[PDB]
Design a protein around this ligand. Structure first.
Ligand SMILES: [Ca+2]
Ligand SMILES: [Ca+2]
Ligand SMILES: [Ca+2]
Ligand SMILES: [Ca+2]
Ligand SMILES: [Ca+2]
Ligand SMILES: [Ca+2]
Lengths: 64, 64, 64
Protein backbone atom coordinates (compact mmCIF):
# COMPACT_ATOMS: atom_id res chain seq x y z
CA UNK A 1 0.00 0.00 0.00
CA UNK A 2 0.84 3.69 -0.57
CA UNK A 3 3.32 2.82 -3.30
CA UNK A 4 2.34 5.68 -5.61
CA UNK A 5 2.27 8.15 -2.72
CA UNK A 6 5.80 7.10 -1.75
CA UNK A 7 6.91 7.54 -5.35
CA UNK A 8 5.67 11.12 -5.64
CA UNK A 9 6.85 11.81 -2.08
CA UNK A 10 10.42 12.13 -3.32
CA UNK A 11 11.96 13.42 -0.05
CA UNK A 12 10.03 10.91 2.09
CA UNK A 13 8.70 13.38 4.66
CA UNK A 14 5.19 11.87 4.45
CA UNK A 15 3.68 14.87 2.70
CA UNK A 16 3.35 15.58 -0.99
CA UNK A 17 4.42 19.12 -1.90
CA UNK A 18 3.73 21.22 -5.01
CA UNK A 19 7.32 20.67 -6.21
CA UNK A 20 6.89 16.90 -6.08
CA UNK A 21 3.60 17.01 -7.86
CA UNK A 22 5.19 19.16 -10.59
CA UNK A 23 8.09 16.75 -10.88
CA UNK A 24 5.89 13.68 -10.99
CA UNK A 25 3.83 15.02 -13.83
CA UNK A 26 6.96 15.87 -15.77
CA UNK A 27 8.24 12.38 -15.14
CA UNK A 28 4.96 10.82 -16.32
CA UNK A 29 4.82 12.96 -19.46
CA UNK A 30 8.33 11.82 -20.43
CA UNK A 31 7.54 8.14 -19.83
CA UNK A 32 4.42 8.15 -22.02
CA UNK A 33 6.64 9.80 -24.65
CA UNK A 34 9.37 7.16 -24.15
CA UNK A 35 6.69 4.58 -24.65
CA UNK A 36 4.91 5.91 -27.72
CA UNK A 37 8.32 6.38 -29.41
CA UNK A 38 9.47 2.92 -28.34
CA UNK A 39 6.31 1.41 -29.82
CA UNK A 40 6.69 3.26 -33.08
CA UNK A 41 10.38 2.29 -33.19
CA UNK A 42 9.29 -1.23 -32.38
CA UNK A 43 7.04 -1.21 -35.45
CA UNK A 44 9.63 0.08 -37.93
CA UNK A 45 12.26 -2.34 -36.57
CA UNK A 46 10.65 -5.17 -38.58
CA UNK A 47 13.27 -7.85 -38.01
CA UNK A 48 13.20 -6.65 -34.39
CA UNK A 49 17.01 -6.75 -34.12
CA UNK A 50 17.30 -3.42 -32.30
CA UNK A 51 18.50 -1.15 -35.10
CA UNK A 52 16.67 0.21 -38.16
CA UNK A 53 18.45 -0.52 -41.46
CA UNK A 54 17.94 1.18 -44.82
CA UNK A 55 15.50 -1.51 -45.93
CA UNK A 56 13.25 -1.10 -42.90
CA UNK A 57 13.54 2.66 -43.06
CA UNK A 58 12.67 2.62 -46.77
CA UNK A 59 9.63 0.44 -46.17
CA UNK A 60 8.52 3.05 -43.61
CA UNK A 61 9.41 6.35 -45.25
CA UNK A 62 7.89 5.01 -48.48
CA UNK A 63 4.52 4.88 -46.72
CA UNK A 64 3.82 8.63 -46.38
CA UNK B 1 0.88 52.29 -21.33
CA UNK B 2 3.15 49.93 -23.32
CA UNK B 3 3.57 47.64 -20.33
CA UNK B 4 3.35 44.41 -22.32
CA UNK B 5 5.65 45.77 -25.02
CA UNK B 6 8.24 46.64 -22.37
CA UNK B 7 7.91 43.15 -20.91
CA UNK B 8 8.63 41.37 -24.19
CA UNK B 9 11.28 43.99 -25.03
CA UNK B 10 13.72 42.29 -22.68
CA UNK B 11 16.83 44.32 -23.64
CA UNK B 12 14.90 47.63 -23.66
CA UNK B 13 16.11 48.87 -27.05
CA UNK B 14 12.56 49.87 -28.07
CA UNK B 15 12.21 47.12 -30.65
CA UNK B 16 10.87 43.61 -30.27
CA UNK B 17 13.12 41.00 -31.89
CA UNK B 18 12.43 37.40 -32.91
CA UNK B 19 14.46 36.13 -29.92
CA UNK B 20 12.30 38.08 -27.50
CA UNK B 21 9.11 36.91 -29.08
CA UNK B 22 10.35 33.32 -28.83
CA UNK B 23 11.28 33.82 -25.20
CA UNK B 24 8.01 35.47 -24.30
CA UNK B 25 5.97 32.63 -25.70
CA UNK B 26 8.07 30.13 -23.79
CA UNK B 27 7.56 32.16 -20.66
CA UNK B 28 3.79 32.30 -21.20
CA UNK B 29 3.52 28.57 -21.89
CA UNK B 30 5.30 27.80 -18.60
CA UNK B 31 3.08 30.18 -16.60
CA UNK B 32 -0.18 28.68 -17.89
CA UNK B 33 1.34 25.31 -16.92
CA UNK B 34 2.33 26.63 -13.46
CA UNK B 35 -1.23 27.78 -13.10
CA UNK B 36 -3.13 24.70 -14.24
CA UNK B 37 -0.92 22.56 -11.97
CA UNK B 38 -1.34 24.98 -9.06
CA UNK B 39 -5.12 24.82 -9.48
CA UNK B 40 -5.16 21.05 -9.60
CA UNK B 41 -2.83 20.94 -6.58
CA UNK B 42 -5.12 23.45 -4.95
CA UNK B 43 -8.05 21.06 -5.43
CA UNK B 44 -6.36 17.95 -4.02
CA UNK B 45 -5.01 19.94 -1.04
CA UNK B 46 -8.45 19.74 0.62
CA UNK B 47 -7.54 21.16 4.01
CA UNK B 48 -5.59 23.76 2.01
CA UNK B 49 -2.58 23.53 4.36
CA UNK B 50 0.02 23.50 1.57
CA UNK B 51 0.99 19.83 1.51
CA UNK B 52 -0.93 16.76 0.31
CA UNK B 53 -1.20 14.00 2.94
CA UNK B 54 -2.06 10.34 2.40
CA UNK B 55 -5.72 10.97 3.18
CA UNK B 56 -6.08 13.71 0.57
CA UNK B 57 -4.04 11.75 -1.93
CA UNK B 58 -6.17 8.65 -1.32
CA UNK B 59 -9.38 10.60 -1.80
CA UNK B 60 -7.94 11.74 -5.15
CA UNK B 61 -6.25 8.64 -6.50
CA UNK B 62 -9.34 6.65 -5.50
CA UNK B 63 -11.34 8.70 -8.02
CA UNK B 64 -9.87 7.31 -11.27
CA UNK C 1 19.40 8.84 -52.30
CA UNK C 2 19.21 7.93 -48.59
CA UNK C 3 19.56 11.57 -47.56
CA UNK C 4 16.99 11.39 -44.76
CA UNK C 5 18.40 8.09 -43.51
CA UNK C 6 21.88 9.64 -43.34
CA UNK C 7 20.45 12.61 -41.44
CA UNK C 8 18.84 10.51 -38.72
CA UNK C 9 21.87 8.19 -38.73
CA UNK C 10 23.83 10.72 -36.69
CA UNK C 11 26.87 8.50 -35.95
CA UNK C 12 27.02 7.18 -39.53
CA UNK C 13 27.26 3.48 -38.67
CA UNK C 14 24.62 2.59 -41.29
CA UNK C 15 21.97 1.68 -38.73
CA UNK C 16 19.33 3.86 -37.13
CA UNK C 17 19.13 3.38 -33.36
CA UNK C 18 16.40 4.30 -30.87
CA UNK C 19 18.50 7.22 -29.59
CA UNK C 20 18.75 8.70 -33.07
CA UNK C 21 15.08 8.29 -33.72
CA UNK C 22 14.35 10.05 -30.42
CA UNK C 23 16.73 12.84 -31.30
CA UNK C 24 15.36 13.28 -34.79
CA UNK C 25 11.83 13.68 -33.57
CA UNK C 26 12.93 16.25 -31.03
CA UNK C 27 14.78 18.08 -33.77
CA UNK C 28 11.72 18.04 -36.04
CA UNK C 29 9.38 19.24 -33.29
CA UNK C 30 11.65 22.23 -32.62
CA UNK C 31 11.89 23.14 -36.32
CA UNK C 32 8.12 23.16 -36.86
CA UNK C 33 7.99 25.40 -33.77
CA UNK C 34 10.76 27.66 -35.16
CA UNK C 35 8.72 27.89 -38.30
CA UNK C 36 5.27 28.60 -36.91
CA UNK C 37 6.79 31.31 -34.67
CA UNK C 38 8.80 32.75 -37.55
CA UNK C 39 5.64 32.96 -39.65
CA UNK C 40 3.67 34.64 -36.91
CA UNK C 41 6.59 37.02 -36.29
CA UNK C 42 6.71 37.56 -40.02
CA UNK C 43 3.06 38.65 -39.96
CA UNK C 44 3.36 41.13 -37.08
CA UNK C 45 6.55 42.60 -38.58
CA UNK C 46 4.44 44.59 -41.06
CA UNK C 47 7.17 46.76 -42.55
CA UNK C 48 9.20 43.53 -42.63
CA UNK C 49 12.33 45.29 -41.31
CA UNK C 50 13.25 42.53 -38.84
CA UNK C 51 12.14 44.09 -35.56
CA UNK C 52 8.65 44.75 -34.16
CA UNK C 53 8.09 48.38 -33.12
CA UNK C 54 5.38 49.76 -30.82
CA UNK C 55 3.17 50.62 -33.78
CA UNK C 56 3.24 47.10 -35.21
CA UNK C 57 2.87 45.58 -31.78
CA UNK C 58 -0.09 47.86 -31.03
CA UNK C 59 -1.79 46.93 -34.29
CA UNK C 60 -1.40 43.29 -33.22
CA UNK C 61 -2.17 43.36 -29.51
CA UNK C 62 -5.17 45.58 -30.29
CA UNK C 63 -6.67 42.68 -32.25
CA UNK C 64 -7.49 40.31 -29.35
CA1 LIG D 1 7.54 15.31 0.39
CA1 LIG E 1 16.43 -4.17 -38.02
CA1 LIG F 1 14.51 44.40 -27.89
CA1 LIG G 1 -3.25 18.99 3.30
CA1 LIG H 1 23.47 5.08 -36.16
CA1 LIG I 1 9.13 46.61 -38.11
Amino acid sequence: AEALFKEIDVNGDGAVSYEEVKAFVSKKRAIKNEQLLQLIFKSIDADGNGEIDQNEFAKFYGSI
